[PDB]
Structure 1
């Protein structure tokens, strides 16, 4: 019993990626202090992310520079943590036949997405929904 479709994006997790927001052109960033935002600075050391699978279509998203995992708490706020738990698994799905989206597995029934606003701020889960621009990502090679 899923609450979501199962169209998966092409590709694999062999190499690190930049998660590029086509909304405002920011890369997803996990800062050393555990806060999460976006930056247009392609040379930023905290935007290189290693994704890895749990079950098919499930991913962890980890900062290569600090070892922090992307997590979403019970208010729907993104944060970084050294310790991955159930709050740090996302359903990776194809969207609009092209982009990646990342839904909180823990809060999947709420349709809470990872998202980045045009101003480079992270969205909060309850302020996201299908059909928004801020939830659409591309996973770009770092090299």
Structure 2
């Protein structure tokens, strides 16, 4: 059920703090990297931090944060690209993707686009 989102750009797992803060971590042991990907509509998902009990949201300024409740900003188009990596594109801000920098900090949505390694993720099983 619970997955971990491994980013190709540095090998960071997307982390959601109980705080609402979003970042990346390389440690498989981190309790805040276990995510629940729920289908809404065919090919649309919401991303929940199991432990944080919050939903990933993208703001109109490209910020990444985690919300206590589900809003129009918590829906993403989940796509299996040619390379077998998944991309998560904001349903509201249709040009922006969830992305992580090779630093472990998230990348502003407004700076993302196709061809970038930052937007590539590999959903893995949460069995460390």
Q: Same fold (TM over 0.5)?
A: yes
- For the aligned pair, the TM-score class normalised by the smaller chain equals over 0.9
Q: Which runs of 5+ in 1 are unaligned?
A: 1-14
Q: Give distance in 1, aligned partners of 2:86 and 2:52.
A: 24
Answer with 1 or 2: which has the greater Rg: 1
Q: Give distance in 2, aligned partners of 1:115 and 1:125.
A: 7
TM (norm. structure 1) is 0.87
Q: Which runs of 5+ in 2 are unaligned?
A: none
Number of residues of Structure 1 aligned to a counterpart in Structure 2: 127
Following TM superposition, the consecutive aligned residue runs of length 4 or more in structure 1 with deviations greater than 3 angstroms are none
- 1:130: which partner in 2? 114
| Helix, strand or coil at the partner of 1:46 | helix
Counterpart of 1:139 (choices 107, 123, 127) is: 123
| Helix, strand or coil at the partner of 1:134 | helix
TM (norm. structure 2) is 0.97
- CA RMSD across the alignment: 0.7
Q: Give distance in 1, aligned partners of 2:49 and 2:19.
A: 12
Q: Give distance in 1, aligned partners of 2:11 and 2:120.
A: 11
